[PDB]
Amino acid sequence: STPDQSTAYMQGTAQADSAFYLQQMQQSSDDTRINWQLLAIRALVKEGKTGQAVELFNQLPQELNDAQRREKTLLAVEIKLAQKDFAGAQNLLAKITPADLEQNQQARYWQAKIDASQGRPSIDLLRALIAQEPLLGAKEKQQNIDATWQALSSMTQEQANTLVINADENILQGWLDLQRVWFDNRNDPDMMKAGIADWQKRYPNNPGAKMLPTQLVNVKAFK
Numbered sequence: 307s308t309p310d311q312s313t314a315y316m317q318g319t320a321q322a323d324s325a326f327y328l329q330q331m332q333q334s335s336d337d338t339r340i341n342w343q344l345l346a347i348r349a350l351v352k353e354g355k356t357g358q359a360v361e362l363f364n365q366l367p368q369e370l371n372d373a374q375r376r377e378k379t380l381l382a383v384e385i386k387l388a389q390k391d392f393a394g395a396q397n398l399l400a401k402i403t404p405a406d407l408e409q410n411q412q413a414r415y416w417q418a419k420i421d422a423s424q425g426r427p428s429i430d431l432l433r434a435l436i437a438q439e440p441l442l443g444a445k446e447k448q449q450n451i452d453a454t455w456q457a458l459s460s461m462t463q464e465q466a467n468t469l470v471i472n473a474d475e476n477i478l479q480g481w482l483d484l485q486r487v488w489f490d491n492r493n494d495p496d497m498m499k500a501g502i503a504d505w506q507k508r509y510p511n512n513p514g515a516k517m518l519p520t521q522l523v524n525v526k527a528f529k
Contacts, residue, residue, distance in 0.1 A: 310341065311338055316345060318411075318413070319410075326349075327349055331346055344378065347363050383395050383415075395421075395422055416441070435453055436478055447513060476509075477509075477511070498525075
């Protein structure tokens with residue numbers, strides 16, 4: 307559609323801090339102001355200013371368009387996570403259909419699911435990291451990839467043996483294969499490196515094949 311003052315920021319193709327958004331909010335009215343207000347809430351949450359995020363969220367007009375209301379529901383999750391209301395966050399997340407969101411919103415939707423797990427390795431966390439990775443820019447992928455690896459390497463052989471994946475989860479299957487490579491060769495750095503190289507040729511589409519977990523590249527060992 308026709309771009310307005312805040313399109314890029316709303317869509318996540320540009321970023322600014324809450325001070326900027328609040329300044330623009332004070333120089334606008336009507337829907338332009340609502341958009342800046344929604345962005346201020348988003349930035350306030352990110353910056354740790356939970357009180358002001360809540361208050362500005364409570365000052366949102368009742369008459370929002372569909373795009374503005376969808377953003378409001380997503381901000382509601384981020385606020386509850388900031389308030390440590392993980393139970394309330396899970397309840398709101400369950401009522402959201404990820405397909406109905408834009409990429410930036412989908413990336414934040416999955417980040418909310420990742421945050422809800424609190425680094426607890428489970429199949430749910432792996433799926434959330436895997437679903438988010440295609441939505442992230444190159445400079446934000448490594449962080450996601452490294453979190454995926456920590457979750458995998460934090461499991462035991464027994465815990466991983468109990469995982470049940472679906473036939474169409476080829477990326478997760480590839481991750482679990484590398485996990486096994488780690489279980490089997492972690493006592494031989496030279497064979498570990500070769501096992502990783504063969505895995506990269508087994509699952510060349512896996513994000514970790516093109517961008518190895520930092521933990522597996524930066525390793526020590528002895529002569």
